[PDB]
């Protein structure tokens, strides 16, 4: 499984960009962001999204350090998360998926290797 790797100094905040675009599909989306380290598996953030400008509906959420970035610009989309307040302990893989589930694709998904590293 292909990562990009992400480097942010201990105690600041990463964004971490979901990238999923589509012309005419970004519509009525589920989503889901994950966490991955060696034995630890996390689900995030979960919702659902009407359209690329709408407010998103969070359905689940496992920490207050996790927010939506409330934008959009280029390639990075409104299920993009900011995760705040970083600690040591945020270092491994976060992984976005989406899915239309009206459709009979597979879930679309990418993988960031956060690295959080230390403060000057």
């Not at 960009?17 to 989503?31: I, N, V």
């Not at 999204?49 to 959420?61: A, C, F, G, H, I």
Request: aromatic share 10%; with cysteine; hydrophobic share 35%.
């Amino acid at each position: 499984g292909k990562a990009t790797d992400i480097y942010a100094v201990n105690g600041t905040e990463i964004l971490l960009p979901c990238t999923f675009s589509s012309c005419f599909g970004f519509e009525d989306l589920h989503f889901r962001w994950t966490y991955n380290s060696s034995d630890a598996f996390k689900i995030l953030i979960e919702g659902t999204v009407k359209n690329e400008k709408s407010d998103p509906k969070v359905t689940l959420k496992d920490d207050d350090r996790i927010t939506l970035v409330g934008s959009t610009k280029e390639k990075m989309n409104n299920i993009s998360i900011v995760l705040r307040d970083l600690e040591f302990s945020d270092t491994g893989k976060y992984t976005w998926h989406v899915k239309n589930p009206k459709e009979n694709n597979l879930q679309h998904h990418a993988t960031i290797f956060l690295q959080v590293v230390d403060r000057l």
